[PDB]
Amino acid sequence: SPEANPIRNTHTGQIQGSLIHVKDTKAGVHTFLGIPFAKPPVGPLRFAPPEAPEPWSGVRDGTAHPAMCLQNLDMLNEAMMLSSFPMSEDCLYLNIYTPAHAHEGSNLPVMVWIHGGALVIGMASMFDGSLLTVNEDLVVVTIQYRLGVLGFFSTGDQHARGNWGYLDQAAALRWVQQNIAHFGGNPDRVTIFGESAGGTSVSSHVVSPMSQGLFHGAIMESGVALLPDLISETSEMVSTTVAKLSGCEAMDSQALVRCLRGKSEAEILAINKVFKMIPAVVDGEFFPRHPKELLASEDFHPVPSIIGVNNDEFGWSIPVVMGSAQMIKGITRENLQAVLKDTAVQMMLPPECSDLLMEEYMGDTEDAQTLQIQFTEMMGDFMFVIPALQVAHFQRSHAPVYFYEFQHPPSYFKDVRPPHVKADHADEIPFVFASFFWGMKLDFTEEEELLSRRMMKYWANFARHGNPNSEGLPYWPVMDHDEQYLQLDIQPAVGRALKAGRLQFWTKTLPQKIQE
Ligand SMILES: NC(=O)c1cccnc1
Ligand SMILES: NC(=O)c1cccnc1
Ligand SMILES: [Cl-]
């Protein structure tokens, strides 16, 4: 029988969790919250690799959510007295959801969720794994990792190599290998999954040599390792911005890192506040080479993967949160050329390419509303769709890739945002978790409940077998030379060669015009 207050072993000592959802489910869920997977990255461990967590005597309380990593709460709120929730540099914790029948040796598949938030916001407690664990009989782990300046500050040299947050994620995955059997998970059957910066994180583990053997499958929702804003060949803009805001100017790398280690949490938060996103670098430990080189390597051996995108990734929430929404509403045929020259610069293209962008996405269009929708379409393709299609192409010659486009505009958002918005950024997450953030219930239509049951079963079948297919689910073909992908909506359908024209434009036509 499941205990009300179950006690489990870890390498660092015993922990007590909770039994929940006994009434509204068959046989309930065990939660174990706030488990340390690394030593707190404070004092000299700020801008240093994660180190082994300390052992304890007695039974650790696993009934409270951990502190979130330091982040800008205004931005997290744009994405509720979040000021009452604990926030600390001491934030390297993970949460576990298990079916209440699980014990040492149950050998259930494990799914490890890596949250998004552009590597500057988010927390594990936002994602309640309870319904995924009970509906699909698996262990769900939600992890934290250092965010913003504390996660991704680099000097480009030995004093701060960078990618602290990715090293944290790998430390959490090593904890899962070491400990998950004590909670009834099979460490040989771990799937990493994540959305947006979390998808980028997952895709980054898929290429990182020191992450190999920490997982057996990968699910990348609306983000991969080539998401342009989250990967950089230079450390220079971030480090010079941080030196200026911190008052640690006119210092070498060694003195800059020493100066930044003396800063309080409040001083770090004030420096951190300007970053709406922060990139990973080629740090040498996590990425020995740029992800594009690792993906193209003849020695690349990716795990089986699901990779997918939504049909309106830049439709509403990203431009609103990033503060580009006002500029977009200002687009007309009169200023379009100037907007596309500015956009070309942000895309790291020559501003001469603005005419090619205009012809590809806007053509002869005059209507301002249509131009603004074409602009968001272009941004979504550049940031999410083309990178996803490129990574899927690099992987699928080595290992199974199942590709999806999620298309369903959620019923509960119809009155909250413009009616032209289709499946926005993050719209698929509640279909995978069968709940909104913090496990809050949603008024799904009957049709939406079926799409959620299907997506949960595809994901869990993939966690079990590296193949999403099973009886009663529409057949999802593996991605091969026919470029097949599953269109996820109320009536799922198979498509071929998603946005093949756009892929030709971005990967062949546009680089040819640049070469000239
Ligand atoms: N939410 C995210 O992780 C995100 C949003 C925009 C850009 N990159 C990442
Ligand atoms: N129509 C709008 O208000 C809008 C908001 C955000 C992005 N694009 C358009
Ligand atoms: Cl510790």
Residue numbers in the entry: 29 to 107, 114 to 550
Provide passages from the article that reported this PDB entry.
Here, we present the first crystal structure of mCes2c to 2.12 Å resolution. The structure contains four monomers in the asymmetric unit (pairwise RMSD values of 0.15 Å), which are referred to as chains A–D, with the biological assembly being a monomer. In all 4 chains, residues C97-C125 and C282-C293 form disulfide bonds. In each monomer of the experimental structure of mCes2c, additional electron density was observed that could ideally be fitted to one molecule of nicotinamide (NCA) in the substrate binding pockets with 100% occupancy. Analysis of the ligand–protein interaction reveals H-bonding of the NCA-carbonyl oxygen to the backbone amide protons of oxyanion-hole residues G151, A152, and A231. The presence of NCA leads to restricted access to the active site within the core. In the structure we found electron density at the Z-site and could fit a single NCA molecule in chains A and B. Only residual electron density can be observed in chains C and D, which could not be fitted unambiguously to a distinct small molecule with full occupancy. In mCes2c, the entrance to the substrate binding pocket of each monomer is framed mostly by flexible loops and helical parts of the cap, the RD including the gate residue M417, and parts of the core. Similar to the product release mechanism of hCES1 proposed by Bencharit et al. next to the active site in the site door region, mCes2c harbors the conserved gate (M417) and switch (F418) residues. The low-resolution shape of mCes2c reconstructed from SAXS profiles fit (ꭓ2 = 1.4) to the experimentally determined crystal structure of mCes2c. Together the biochemical, structural, and biophysical experiments all corroborate the predominantly monomeric state of mCes2c.
Mouse Ces2c (mCes2c) is suggested as potential ortholog of human CES2. Similarly, in a murine colitis model and in obese mice, a decline of mCes2 expression is observed in the colon. Both enzymes, hCES2 and mCes2c, can hydrolyze classical carboxylesterase substrates including acyl-carnitine, they can be inhibited by anti-rat CES antibodies, and they have high activities towards triacylglycerols, diacylglycerols, and monoacylglycerols as substrate. The monomeric unit of mCes2c harbors an α/β-hydrolase fold with additional modules and insertions. The core of the α/β-hydrolase domain in mCes2c is built by amino acids V57-M96, L126-L260, D317-G349, and F418-N501, and it contains the active site residues S230, E347, and H459 forming a catalytic triad.
